[PDB]
Symmetry: C2
Subunit: 171 residues, 2 copies
């Protein structure tokens, strides 16, 4: 499956510092039973988009924490203010299998303040757009993706999970 | 290495028909000694971007002709006019190794009417933007990429190669 994240606040290339991954340097990570590729299809002052493509042979969550580890912690040494604030962000998850249909997807992400779009073909493409922190976009995806198929949930459920109408399903 | 192509003439999703690859369906191709992944990080009415990511273990040219075969022929059944005309296009080639430095890159692409940008790190990222046909963007990349590291050159050198200041280097 694939994850993209798009940010357009000029210098949109700041997403590079926030994710702690240089736009000019595509990279591959060897995982348990598969590869993760990361690159930025777009890295200008107007638009910046990161992609993380999973090649296999929960895995995304693993890939997300392996690749976007420091961003998850909430830290950005070079732009401490952008890490700290809600940014206008778009994210896309392509080829997400989900037994519970699209209704459970809306049910997990809408409560978090995301405008949510679901496209089916059974795999899904989910589009999210909101004003959230980097670390919270990543945390949500990291926690909810597996649910759609306790320390983790403790560390990454932080400051959103308590007020979640589906918090018990998630738990 | 990676190739992206971006098109923004609204219905920018027309790039999907031109490339004959559905934006909603990421796909993997098994090759001689590697994989090619294709997907569209962006597929809206305002912007459409295709990516082709090579995972190995000339290969790009192979991948390009395998994946974008029909677009190379110049045909688009659903938008015959867009295939026929010069479109405003941007393309990116990331992680291109090139012994001859950036000077040979400018030398191969600028004559074709591309605004060309080269970034080094030895691998290169080359950015191209011009008003060319789909089939000609693809042909140029398919022919010049190997040069930067006769039937082919005959079929794909068509209607650009004769007037090329470096046509003999290419040949």
């Amino acid at each position: 499956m694939i994850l993209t994240i798009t940010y357009t606040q000029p210098p949109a290339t700041d997403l590079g510092y926030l994710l702690h991954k240089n736009p000019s340097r595509p990279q591959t990570f060897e995982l348990n039973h598969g590869k993760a590729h990361i690159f930025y299809p777009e890295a200008t002052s107007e638009r910046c988009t990161v992609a993380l493509l999973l090649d296999i042979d929960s895995f995304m969550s693993v890939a997300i924490s392996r690749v976007f580890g420091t961003a998850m912690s909430g830290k950005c040494k070079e732009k401490p203010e952008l890490a700290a604030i809600k940014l206008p962000l778009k994210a896309k998850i392509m080829m997400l299998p989900c037994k519970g249909g699209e209704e459970i997807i809306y049910r997990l992400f809408e409560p978090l303040g995301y405008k949510v779009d679901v496209e089916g073909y059974r795999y899904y493409t989910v589009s999210l757009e909101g004003e959230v922190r980097v670390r919270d976009l990543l945390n949500h995806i990291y926690v909810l993706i597996p649910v759609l198929d306790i320390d983790k949930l403790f560390q990454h459920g932080e400051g959103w999970l308590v007020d979640h109408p589906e918090k018990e399903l998630i738990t």
